[PDB]
Design an enzyme around this catalytic site. Structure first.
Site, PDB file in Angstrom:
ATOM      1  N   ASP A 194      44.681  46.028  42.673  1.00 32.90           N
ATOM      2  CA  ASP A 194      45.570  45.121  41.980  1.00 32.90           C
ATOM      3  C   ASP A 194      45.003  43.730  42.156  1.00 32.90           C
ATOM      4  O   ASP A 194      43.985  43.507  42.837  1.00 32.90           O
ATOM      5  CB  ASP A 194      47.033  45.208  42.460  1.00 32.90           C
ATOM      6  CG  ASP A 194      47.314  44.374  43.689  1.00 32.90           C
ATOM      7  OD1 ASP A 194      46.362  44.038  44.400  1.00 32.90           O
ATOM      8  OD2 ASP A 194      48.504  44.068  43.944  1.00 32.90           O
ATOM      9  N   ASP A 196      46.336  39.673  42.910  1.00 29.37           N
ATOM     10  CA  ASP A 196      47.428  38.862  43.411  1.00 29.37           C
ATOM     11  C   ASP A 196      47.185  37.379  43.158  1.00 29.37           C
ATOM     12  O   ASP A 196      46.096  36.862  43.461  1.00 29.37           O
ATOM     13  CB  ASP A 196      47.621  39.075  44.934  1.00 29.37           C
ATOM     14  CG  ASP A 196      47.695  40.557  45.276  1.00 29.37           C
ATOM     15  OD1 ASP A 196      48.709  41.141  44.880  1.00 29.37           O
ATOM     16  OD2 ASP A 196      46.687  41.160  45.761  1.00 29.37           O
ATOM     17  N   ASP A 250      50.331  41.032  40.733  1.00 27.12           N
ATOM     18  CA  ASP A 250      51.465  40.443  41.415  1.00 27.12           C
ATOM     19  C   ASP A 250      51.410  38.926  41.260  1.00 27.12           C
ATOM     20  O   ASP A 250      50.357  38.324  41.459  1.00 27.12           O
ATOM     21  CB  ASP A 250      51.469  40.787  42.904  1.00 27.12           C
ATOM     22  CG  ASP A 250      51.655  42.266  43.167  1.00 27.12           C
ATOM     23  OD1 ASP A 250      52.336  42.883  42.337  1.00 27.12           O
ATOM     24  OD2 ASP A 250      51.130  42.742  44.215  1.00 27.12           O
TER      25      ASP A 250
HETATM   26 MG    MG Z   1      49.363  43.162  45.205  1.00 26.52          MG
HETATM   27 MG    MG Z   2      45.977  43.144  46.158  1.00 27.15          MG
END
Ligand code: MG
Ligand code: MG
Ligand code: CL
Ligand code: NA
Ligand code: NA
Length: 326
Positions: A194, A196, A250
């Site tokens: 992912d 961030d 995120d």
């Molecule tokens: Mg994350």
């Molecule tokens: Mg991450």
DNA sequence: CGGCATACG
DNA sequence: CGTA
DNA sequence: GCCG
């Protein structure tokens, strides 16, 4: 020569004991699947000690005096050194329980407790879950639909294109607001599960109400495949040659007064931050979180202008992000 | 033995 | 319960 | 599972 907390030692992203640390992390993960958070922490910590060593462990002798190595973790290493495999680790790897709990907890929206309940119900595969959408939250539905894309690593090349898209939306939502890459990419990873981002504004208070404005703008751009405030856990459409793929992103907003604490927390690693908060509370009597550092005796919050400030407050040598890969 | 990080959605 |  |  090896301190007991991971926050007291540099831990680089790549190291000299990869096989040994991976085996211990399998046992940590399996402990977590059974709800044994203490044993998970010990196996995680023992793995991280090996990541911090300056050269390969070749002999059982070299574990003497290392923190978090007792009879169990030492026997795992002993078996790997002598035979190249640890029977307990291999038994975990091929177990139906481990493989299914890993598969289910990898789904966005599914934690250990849900996975364990499904396991006890007899479910074993993703198609088993797809055939009973009665049992799924909207979040789990998105996680299952996008599971294949989300299982493919994000490249640093992807991250930069994504940051410019986030910055455009953030700039319309609030001119002057900034976007900082955090998480594993800030620690030097070339890939990740992912991406961030931490958002702030140099004028204290201007960031209030910002994240909804950012999310509405990204959604109007057609870039949000899923979203549900100051933290948003999203699935984004990322361009690809002649098509696109889903990526977990995120987004976090913090006031600039808290930014160093949020940067520290969201940069990780997870074990590093747990160890840093444990160190703060148990060794220094100070309470740390992603918003601040509290002295409970004076009932005052430490002002920090940088991560360097926070390490100094806690009496720790500064570690750059690339040495926080505990 | 107790403790094991600490938040937000 | 999920998420970090 | 390990530490203090
Ligand atoms: Mg994350
Ligand atoms: Mg991450
Ligand atoms: Cl435990
Ligand atoms: Na999950
Ligand atoms: Na969906």
């Amino acid at each position: 020569w090896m301190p007991a907390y991971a926050c007291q030692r540099p831990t680089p992203l790549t190291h000299h004991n990869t096989g040994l640390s991976e085996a211990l992390e399998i046992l940590a993960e399996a402990a977590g699947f059974e709800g044994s958070e203490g044993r998970l922490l010990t196996f995680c910590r023992a793995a991280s000690v090996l990541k911090a060593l300056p050269s390969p462990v070749t002999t059982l002798s070299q574990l003497q005096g290392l923190p978090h190595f007792g009879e169990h973790s030492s026997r795992v290493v002993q078996e790997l050194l002598e035979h190249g495999v640890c029977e307990e680790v291999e038994r975990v790897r091929r177990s139906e329980r481990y493989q299914t709990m890993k598969l289910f907890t990898q789904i966005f929206g599914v934690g250990v407790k849900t996975a364990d309940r499904w396991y006890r119900e007899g479910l074993r595969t993703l198609d088993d879950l797809r055939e009973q959408p009665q049992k799924l939250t909207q979040q789990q539905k998105a996680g299952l639909q996008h599971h294949q894309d989300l299982s493919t690593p994000v490249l640093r090349s992807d991250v930069d294109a994504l940051q410019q898209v986030v910055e455009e939306a953030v700039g319309q939502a609030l001119p002057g607001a900034t976007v900082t890459l955090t998480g594993g990419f800030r620690r030097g990873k070339l890939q990740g599960h992912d991406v961030d981002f931490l958002i702030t504004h140099p004028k204290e208070g201007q960031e209030a109400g910002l994240l909804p404005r950012v999310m509405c703008r990204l959604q109007d751009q057609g870039l949000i495949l899923y979203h549900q405030f100051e933290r948003s856990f999203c699935i984004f459409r990322l361009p690809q040659p002649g098509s696109w793929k889903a990526v977990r992103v995120d987004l976090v907003v913090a006031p600039v007064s808290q930014f160093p604490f949020a940067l520290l927390g969201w940069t990780g690693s997870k074990l590093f931050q747990r160890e840093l908060r444990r160190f703060s509370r148990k060794e220094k009597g100070l309470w740390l979180n992603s918003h601040g550092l509290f002295d409970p005796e004076q009932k005052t919050f430490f002002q920090a202008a940088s991560e360097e400030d926070i390490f100094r407050h806690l009496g720790l040598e500064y570690l750059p992000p690339e040495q926080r890969n505990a």
